[PDB]
Amino acid sequence: AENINSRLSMVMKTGQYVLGYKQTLKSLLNGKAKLVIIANNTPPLRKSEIEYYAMLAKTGVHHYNGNNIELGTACGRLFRVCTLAVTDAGDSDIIL
Amino acid sequence: GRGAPLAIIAFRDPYKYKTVKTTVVAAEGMHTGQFIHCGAKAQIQIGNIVPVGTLPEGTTICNVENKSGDRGVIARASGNYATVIAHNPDTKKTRIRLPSGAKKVVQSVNRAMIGLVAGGGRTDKPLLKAGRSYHKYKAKRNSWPRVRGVAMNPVEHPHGGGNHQHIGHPSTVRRDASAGKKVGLIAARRTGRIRGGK
Amino acid sequence: DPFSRKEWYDIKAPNMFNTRQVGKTLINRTQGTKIASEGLKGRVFEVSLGDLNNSEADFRKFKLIAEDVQGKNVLTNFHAMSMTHDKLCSIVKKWHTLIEANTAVKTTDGYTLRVFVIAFTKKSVNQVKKTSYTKTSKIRKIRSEMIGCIEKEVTGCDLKEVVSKLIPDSIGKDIEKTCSKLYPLQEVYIRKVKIIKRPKVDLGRLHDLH
Amino acid sequence: AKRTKKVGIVGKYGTRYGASLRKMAKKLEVAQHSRYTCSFCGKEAMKRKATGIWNCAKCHKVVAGGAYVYGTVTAATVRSTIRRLRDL
Amino acid sequence: TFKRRNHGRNKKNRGHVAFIRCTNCGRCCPKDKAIKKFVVRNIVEAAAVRDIGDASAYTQYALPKLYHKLHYCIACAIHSKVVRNRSREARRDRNPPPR
Amino acid sequence: LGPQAKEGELIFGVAHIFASFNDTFVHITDISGRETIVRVTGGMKVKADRDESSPYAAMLAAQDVADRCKQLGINALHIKLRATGGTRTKTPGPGAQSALRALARAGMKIGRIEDVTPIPSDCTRRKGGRRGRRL
Amino acid sequence: MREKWRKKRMRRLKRKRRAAKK
RNA sequence: ACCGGGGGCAUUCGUAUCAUUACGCGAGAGGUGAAAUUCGUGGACCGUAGUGAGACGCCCAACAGCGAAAGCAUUUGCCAAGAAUGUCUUCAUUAAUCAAGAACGAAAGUCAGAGGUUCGAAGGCGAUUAGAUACCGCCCUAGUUCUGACCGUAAACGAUGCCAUCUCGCGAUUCGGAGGGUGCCCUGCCGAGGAGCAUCCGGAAACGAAAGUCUUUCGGUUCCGGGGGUAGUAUGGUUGCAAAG
RNA sequence: GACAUUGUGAAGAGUCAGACUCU
RNA sequence: UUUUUUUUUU
Structure with a gap:
């Protein structure tokens, strides 16, 4: 729980990522998404869509313990993030 | 004319190809796009309509059915709710506590909605202006403004008349008084400010 | 004489106890719609384990509830258990920590029993320290151990076996021997046992009981 | 500059209706004219439409809430009780 | 003039101590300040133990005991003579008196 | 009988x-306690209210109780001592010993003796003021 | 309960003085 | 396997008090120095078994612990925080005390909404008395309880400001550590607490291991006093709904 | 309150000599 | 159980 915050911070500082539903979908389609993180207030339809995409692409989905406001705060941004895709763990152990 | 919002809910007819719309007073927290489950096997969620027999003691409910099938008659005003006090499986009955503080026994199959009626806290803001009362009652019925009986003449009211504005007789009248006489504190068990709990 | 209307009945305890003779009760004879047997059904009698099993556990008290009447015989069944006030007051001592617990355990025949356990920290043999206190975290651990042990003992049995285990207070001794790993315990007892939920009266089962 | 020292929103009432009544009306007037964080989209876009009806400007969700507050304390406790019973 | 070094209490490392109601007067007194007495007695007075034993329905019965913890305020303790005033030097003695 | x-x-x-x-x-009651054989109080034996709790009044009450018990064939008694308890005093009054000894002397066998004074885990506020009974 | 009563007396006097000044 | 009644929110349990239901009883019960008011054959009080409400967490419970102080004690879950100890970890003077300024702050009290068991100001009765607007007894209203706001005062006391440093012996106690023996014992063990009795010096004395190391005055710093009253009064200012600060 | 609408069974109590009365 | 007072100076 508290570990994913530190791992996400390390990814934001060193790794590569895309914040947002559209880029997450594109990254899943083109297969450069190592992990997908979803806020807990994500719309149910969007959640099911992203999980279906992740099942197709054989990628892991992590249901963050917080809504998009807190997910954005964890990402270190001043806006809301409801979905994000980590494409390169960088110097973190988020993928595992 | 109603202080509590209404919920328009759409159900599917089980016997023909049609949609049936239901208008019920909304429980607080209900939102558009929500799913309401009504029946004996529905779970304990806000907005579900379930028999009172299935609920645990202390549950708060609204739209309670006084008699099985009357379609919800109790605890319908904004912010109000009844509570499930007890069960008796042998007689298949449930004791509930009404908003007024009374306790009533109902059949365990009487349906109710889980939650309390939305719009609570309405009668906390003063109606600072008389125009607000005017608009409030223009949407309900003709019951305003209210003229005091002592301000009338003795022809139109038991309290009217006199060289001083006074009732002249005790204002507590018996229950079986006639139609034109039954004004004031009807069948009052007591009067005056309530010092203690009642 | 107002006592002329009273008929005397004989109280009979179930077969967990050696002495099945408890004592004699009384009630007005049947008159009109008031039936003596119906009136007797439901009475509660408080007896001592000294008067039931003649064992040294005189301080253990048992409540027996009458569920049936046959002729002039009132068949009773276990209703509640409690320790004696004198025993509890004697047990409570200063400079020691008192550990209390209670748990709701379900038997295999539908009886939910709340069991109240009491224990005290023991002095070591070669102890110079006047007090025998311990850390509150250890108190919590010991309390959890007692609850778990009571659950293990009760769950899986039925009312007859749990009453049989209460009669000698085997459970108390097993606690005093098992939970003492964290801190040696003394004067561990099942202070009380009460019935939260009970099944419907089964006259058939009461007969095997009597 | 701060235009009113203490009356705030109820400055529309001038010197009418009594200080205590205006003070009581102030809390609920502020509450009913405030904007609240929506629990569905997470943006501060919930506004009162009518007494008990709260609409979100962004996700267009309509919620049945309090007369002057988006959510009431009693409703919160009832929700907590239902969730607790569900968990245990 | 300060009469006692402890100011009549047993409060150290503490701000507030809950009170108890005296046994006789019912007055509220802090628990550290109240005179406490643990009394263990026979349930039956000494002069009737033989009578109860000879009337016993059992061959050998152990007569129970009464345990009472009594709390007294200073006034109702001095009046009842549970505690007495002492000389200036004897005031500092803290050992319980012989029983 | x-x-x-x-x-x-x-x-x-x-x-x-x-x-x-x-x-x-x-x-006096049965083992269940739901039926009463006989009961006598000190006020039934003494005229003055001041002596309702006197040991002599307790003794007289116990003697009458013993006589009635013998008439009805009860010959043994399980004692249940009790004081006011609750928020009030927990010590038995002055009549308890007189009553018990009087029963024993009358001849009723004495079984188990127990104290059943109602004692709280904690109480409602006691009667007197915060300053107690100043008299 | 000798100076506290003087405080009460002066508080009553100050109440009367306030009322008169109004 | 840290320590703790430290804080918050939910939750569990316990007898007791009161009310009430069923059954038995039979005339008193209650209360006092003695009584009376009061309750009671419409069957009280007393027993046994239930039911409901609200309050409160006995015993364990201590010259015990925690917290800035006020204060803090039924079980369990969750939440954030913290002391001490350990440290061959890190930064490198970032510190002490603090006008103005700000948070918290017992009880009573005020406002609003719920609850209203117990106790209970005011009030009303019964006593006592020369009187009794009291002590005693009976019935009680606000209040006492919960939630959200106000007030900012207590013998809020250790009647002793905070930081650093030096000066005595003894054996106990709470927490952590080190070393041994079998949770307990030992180590004239090491720190940190909270104390007690051998106490130099001090003090008008009572007394104080600080209230000592001050005419041999001088480590730093904040607040306060200047014979008793008038008087924490008048007036002005400011805060508060008021009471009042 | 009485009578009629008002029917079909049980248990208790009381009257009678299988009926009646009540609850 | 009840039990209030004791002019001024010396």
Whole structure:
């Protein structure tokens, strides 16, 4: 729980990522998404869509313990993030 | 004319190809796009309509059915709710506590909605202006403004008349008084400010 | 004489106890719609384990509830258990920590029993320290151990076996021997046992009981 | 500059209706004219439409809430009780 | 003039101590300040133990005991003579008196 | 009138002895406690209210109770001592010992003695003021 | 309960003085 | 396997008090120095078994612990925080005390909404008395309880400001550590607490291991006093709904 | 309150000599 | 259980 915050911070500082539903979908389609993180207030339809995409692409989905406001705060941004895709763990152990 | 919002809910007819719309007073927290489950096997969620027999003691409910099938008659005003006090499986009955503080026994199959009626806290803001009362009652019925009986003449009211504005007789009248006489504190068990709990 | 209307009945305890003779009760004879047997059904009698099993556990008290009447015989069944006030007051001592617990355990025949356990920290043999206190975290651990042990003992049995285990207070001794790993315990007892939920009266089962 | 020292929103009432009544009306007037964080989209876009009806400007969700507050304390406790019973 | 070094209490490392109601007067007194007495007695007075034993329905019965913890305020303790005033030097003695 | 004793059997009743500082009750019941054989109080024996709790009044009440118990065939008594309890005093009044000794002397066999004073885990506020009874 | 009563007396006097000044 | 009644929110349990239901009883019960008011054959009080409400967490419970102080004690879950100890970890003077300024702050009290068991100001009765607007007894209203706001005062006391440093012996106690023996014992063990009795010096004395190391005055710093009253009064200012600060 | 609408069974109590009365 | 007072100076 508290570990994913530190791992996400390390990814934001060193790794590569895309914040947002559209880029997450594109990254899943083109297969450069190592992990997908979803806020807990994500719309149910969007959640099911992203999980279906992740099942197709054989990628892991992590249901963050917080809504998009807190997910954005964890990402270190001043806006809301409801979905994000980590494409390169960088110097973190988020993928595992 | 109603202080509590209404919920328009759409159900599917089980016997023909049609949609049936239901208008019920909304429980607080209900939102558009929500799913309401009504029946004996529905779970304990806000907005579900379930028999009172299935609920645990202390549950708060609204739209309670006084008699099985009357379609919800109790605890319908904004912010109000009844509570499930007890069960008796042998007689298949449930004791509930009404908003007024009374306790009533109902059949365990009487349906109710889980939650309390939305719009609570309405009668906390003063109606600072008389125009607000005017608009409030223009949407309900003709019951305003209210003229005091002592301000009338003795022809139109038991309290009217006199060289001083006074009732002249005790204002507590018996229950079986006639139609034109039954004004004031009807069948009052007591009067005056309530010092203690009642 | 107002006592002329009273008929005397004989109280009979179930077969967990050696002495099945408890004592004699009384009630007005049947008159009109008031039936003596119906009136007797439901009475509660408080007896001592000294008067039931003649064992040294005189301080253990048992409540027996009458569920049936046959002729002039009132068949009773276990209703509640409690320790004696004198025993509890004697047990409570200063400079020691008192550990209390209670748990709701379900038997295999539908009886939910709340069991109240009491224990005290023991002095070591070669102890110079006047007090025998311990850390509150250890108190919590010991309390959890007692609850778990009571659950293990009760769950899986039925009312007859749990009453049989209460009669000698085997459970108390097993606690005093098992939970003492964290801190040696003394004067561990099942202070009380009460019935939260009970099944419907089964006259058939009461007969095997009597 | 701060235009009113203490009356705030109820400055529309001038010197009418009594200080205590205006003070009581102030809390609920502020509450009913405030904007609240929506629990569905997470943006501060919930506004009162009518007494008990709260609409979100962004996700267009309509919620049945309090007369002057988006959510009431009693409703919160009832929700907590239902969730607790569900968990245990 | 300060009469006692402890100011009549047993409060150290503490701000507030809950009170108890005296046994006789019912007055509220802090628990550290109240005179406490643990009394263990026979349930039956000494002069009737033989009578109860000879009337016993059992061959050998152990007569129970009464345990009472009594709390007294200073006034109702001095009046009842549970505690007495002492000389200036004897005031500092803290050992319980012989029983 | 009474039960059928088996040639030396001890017929047991229960004697609830409520010994407050204003009165004393000697109340005989069955083992269940739901039926009362006989009850006598100190006020029934003494005219003056000041002596309702007197040891002599307790003794007289116990003697009458013993006579009635013998008439009805009860010959043994399980004692149940009691004080006011609750928020009030927990010590038995002055009539308890007199009543118990009087029963024993009368001849009723004495079974188990127990104290059943109502004692709280914690209480409602006591009667007196915060300053107590100043008299 | 000798100076506290003087405080009460002066508080009553100050109440009367306030009322008169109004 | 840290320590703790430290804080918050939910939750569990316990007898007791009161009310009430069923059954038995039979005339008193209650209360006092003695009584009376009061309750009671419409069957009280007393027993046994239930039911409901609200309050409160006995015993364990201590010259014990925690917290800035006020204060803090039924079980369990969750939440954030913290002391001491350990440290061959890190930064490198970032510190002490603090006008103005700000948070918290017992009880009573005020406002609003719920609850209203117990106790209970005011009030009303019964006593006592020369009187008794009291002590005693009976019935009680606000209040006492919960939630959200106000007030900012207590013998809020250790009647002793905070930081650093030096000066005595003894054996106990709470927490952590080190070393041994079998949770307990030992180590004239090491720190940190909270104390007690051998106490130099001090003090008008009572007394104080600080209230000592001050005419041999001088480590730093904040607040306060200047014979008793008038008087924490008048007036002005400011805060508060008021009471009042 | 009485009578009629008002029917079909049980248990208790009381009257009678299988009926009646009540609850 | 009840039990209030004792002019001024010396």
